[PDB]
Design a protein around this ligand. Structure first.
Ligand code: FIX
Ligand code: FIX
Ligand code: FIX
Ligand code: CL
Ligand code: ZN
Ligand code: ZN
Ligand code: ZN
Ligand code: ZN
Lengths: 411, 411, 411
């Protein structure tokens, strides 16, 4: 390669053809049941769009939740696509999905699009989507406190080889005072106070599930006020239970910091907000637990640059994705550029956070084009400096970014 | 449209031809008197340039204020345009105004530029400028605590139909301790305590001025430390008087948060600074007062992204403009993109904040070019996804952004 | 200048031809000895690359520090250049230096690059590098608390006309409890108690060193928690000694704010982190000490915009460079644009912070190209407004930005 033009095609092709390992989604293996969502109506009722439609429609939130799935979908399509152009990232995403499946957004024929999905099955749509989105591996969010999901694990169900488990623990860490009673009901003899017994039982709880799911990592989403150390249930659990168990099983600990839950409870999953967090807690964890691995992603735009700098300090920290409110072109671009400039290729640029199966298509299509453009710029800079990049080196670097860095980290 | 080039021309045409409603300025109906500032000398002595010239000139701030308007204008012209290239946004803006008026910056003939304004009346210039800037409606900042402005309203003088009033309340909310003495002198018997009597009289004051002004909204500028609820005069006035009255008359409450007043007293209007604010008070107001409408713009760059996320949570929140220190190309661009990507077209991209008539020319010229660029990108992305946008839908979306969204919100 | 194409040509040439005054580096006049670091092995072992290589290599940090300079350099070359493409800014910089020296990165022949340096003397390489990077003046960081540097000064060493001293005081201001003992060891009779006697001896220490080094400014790097006034050694020493001495000798005070030292002790120089600081202390200093001059650069991305706004308020504030974690293309670009949009040309866009002689080549090459682009955009915008910029004015502006603004400020 010795031309930006030539470089551009080589990079775009390597990126496009590179099978993706999506290390954080809200999808489930087909055999887990209806817990796996898919089709155009599910795409249109994605909570991102529920929030956006409420800024326009005169239909009360109560009434909205009272409508059927199809009715909610019809309202959103009309309000966000017909009455106004679907220029938002979330709306754009729905279109990218339709087009990717072979459907044509030009006609705006929602009924015809729907007819497409009605024909196929879950296992069938999964194969097609994973093919079209070029995703080889999907990491789920497995929460044992969720009855709809725990039932499948207790039944001995196993996800197919393309889906990996990740032990989600928000209820345990953030709501211990209520959750402790559920552990007791499950036979985990935790006591009123934090003593040897409570510690051991919570650890047994973690180990039992690690044994059941064989998770690639344990995870938790945290508030902007997250601090560590801390004399709170969360602080003690992390210190006395999670970290020791994680080290023993060499399992990474994923922290998604910055979410302020339910600032608008009526909106349900669309009612969460964001706040800038202190880096002190993460800094402490990284330094004081050198034998533990940490995967981190933050919600606030204002935490992104310093998070990158922290990654420069600690190799036991792997930063990943452009999470939630960060998953917009303007932010993805600035984040990926800051990350590559200070970390080279030693990071995971993105995850889809897909809640609806088809999203894998747009999530990866929208991000890959931006990442490819960033790569082209960086490769070109060193080419201009006289360096010679081979297509094989490109495919290698791209492989690390979209798949290898993750598996290498989880080990 | 089926090509970026084609799209670009149709988008730019739609943006340029769309009549603008400037929902926040410091301009006054021409019949109000000299408070309506205009001409090249007023543009050159805009406080933005006073701050900039003071970074170069050897002239003391005292000596500067002692100079006549023409002398100050002369100094600023020589210091910021001749001794160094006028590359700053504020300086660039002055040139943009001259050009729009038919004058030629190439000559740098300040004397000739001045001759242009001397042969014109204020009403004439108003028609000229509003025409050039394609501004159909101007929202003023009317402060009933200023003796001069108070005259116009008490005399029953109505403003030009193109100008709308906005009840500014900074003295009341931020300086109650000193303002209460004037409220009493005006017939509003507020006590030195916050009893029912005082509460009722403040409401009466607001109610009376809403009747006299028929404002599109009530407004206040707040410091980075703004909090709510709060046991202070401002906190009690907002809770017990402003919100109740605003809800009863269904008029929005505009909050411009982030200004740290007079960090450099000697600079006058040019001595204000900025600070990041907590989103807690705004979040509280939105959630706890669903029957009230809120217009918000923040001064800190670091508050922009989270403000957008907050708008996603509450439909009774309408964010607007790129205020003051945010009114620069680099910031206008990132802000507008973040806003459209997460809010689609459900927001008001800009306002001029013009203190001098002519500024409407450059403020909107400089902002429309950027907004057009963003729209082109967003339209092209969905266009690439197979969606087809009609030129009529473009005019519709452009109308919402530059005018409809505001009037719709103020109801 | 007719077209943007013609404009770009004249701007690029002026920027490239303009001799640079690098107002902050960690280089020393060659006659000072081996403390002046140079050659490819030094470039490769720059702490920026030590941090980066530790994110990839299996070699422990202890084993790394135990390796020879050559072995460390071989490791870094293989890990960051061969096993992965050298796309990070720091790695790209190493290549740019190689190319600028006439070597060829295409061969990846590290053994051959090393031969180029095995010949030359320090004096020759200084002449070579300064000519290539077109740097006419280099400001050093002279720390009288470092035993080695101190001996040179006490024994009469003077830098040649191309190098200027800057009195660095971190140990005095940030570690006074440890430093007071050393002051006493040097004849400065400070008491354990902070009183008039101690104040006078610290003032005498500063005076003696100002006289010995004839520094262009006194400097210190500060933590994100920096505040002023403050009841602490730093607060008292700045108030009682530094500011009065600086005013008396009319010497500016350079504050580099935002570094959190040694968050990862084992990484040595590569173990410092970043944090956002309050602007309160800087605002206070500028306002209350109008007779003192302050040079400021901040480490947090989130402090940049407000720092610019503060410069608009105070002429005794000169902001400079894109420091450390800010010295990446994505950040340099946004910072430089915000600065010019709000300050025109009244600022110092960059400094190299070079710790290794050859870095001057890449630091200035990478920054000049970015600064050139910003200038082209800004000049083009006013050209489109009708203004006509001459090539002489362009050369003047470029001279101000890269050299004149500094000498003028510290004059
Ligand atoms: O992308 C937005 C989401 O998926 C959130 O609703 C979700 O709660 C978040 O990503 C999480 O994993 O906690
Ligand atoms: O945009 C700069 C301005 O107009 C400020 O001086 C003004 O005080 C501010 O916009 C306000 O309305 O409080
Ligand atoms: O640019 C990175 C550096 O030179 C730092 O190591 C250095 O300590 C910093 O610039 C300073 O002068 O304190
Ligand atoms: Cl911030
Ligand atoms: Zn998620
Ligand atoms: Zn205003
Ligand atoms: Zn940007
Ligand atoms: Zn330095």
């Amino acid at each position: 390669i010795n031309s930006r033009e030539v470089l551009a095609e080589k990079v775009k092709n390597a990126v496009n053809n590179q099978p993706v390992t999506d290390m954080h989604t809200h999808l489930f293996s087909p055999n887990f049941g209806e817990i796996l969502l898919w089709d155009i109506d599910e795409l249109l009722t994605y909570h991102y769009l529920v929030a956006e439609v409420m800024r326009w429609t005169d239909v009360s939130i109560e009434a909205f939740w009272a409508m059927s799935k199809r009715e909610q979908a019809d309202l959103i399509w009309e309000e966000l696509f017909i009455k106004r152009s679907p220029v938002s990232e979330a709306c754009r995403g729905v279109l990218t999905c339709l087009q990717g499946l072979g459907l044509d957004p030009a006609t705006r024929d929602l009924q015809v699009y729907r007819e497409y999905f009605a024909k196929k099955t879950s296992e069938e749509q999964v194969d097609t989507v994973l093919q079209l989105a070029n995703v080889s591996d999907v990491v789920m969010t497995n929460d044992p406190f969720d009855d709809n999901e725990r039932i499948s694990w207790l039944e001995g169900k196993q996800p197919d080889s393309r889906f990996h488990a990740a032990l989600r623990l928000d209820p345990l860490l953030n709501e211990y005072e209520q959750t402790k009673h559920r552990l007791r009901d499950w036979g985990y003899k935790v006591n009123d106070e934090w003593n040897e017994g409570s510690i051991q039982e919570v650890k047994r709880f973690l180990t039992d599930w690690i044994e059941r799911m064989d998770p690639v990592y344990m995870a938790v989403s945290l508030p902007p006020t997250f601090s560590f150390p801390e004399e709170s249930n969360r602080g003690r659990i992390i210190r006395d239970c999670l970290l020791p168990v994680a080290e023993k099983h060499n399992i990474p600990f994923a922290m998604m910091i910055g979410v302020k839950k339910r600032v608008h409870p009526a909106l349900g999953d669309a009612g969460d907000f964001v706040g800038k967090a202190s880096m002190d807690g993460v800094e402490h964890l990284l330094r004081e637990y050198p034998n533990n691995k940490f995967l981190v992603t933050m919600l606030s735009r204002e935490n992104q640059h310093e998070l990158v700098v922290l990654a420069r300090k600690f190799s036991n920290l792997m930063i990943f994705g452009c999470w939630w409110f960060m998953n917009n072109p303007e932010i993805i671009n600035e984040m990926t550029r800051m990350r590559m400039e200070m970390l080279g290729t030693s990071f995971i640029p993105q995850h889809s956070d897909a809640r609806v199966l088809e999203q894998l298509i747009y999530k990866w299509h929208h991000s890959k084009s931006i990442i490819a453009e960033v790569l082209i710029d960086k490769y070109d800079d060193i080419l201009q400096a006289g360096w010679e990049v081979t297509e094989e080196e490109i495919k290698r670097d791209v492989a690390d970014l979209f798949s290898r860095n993750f598996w290498r980290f989880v080990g």
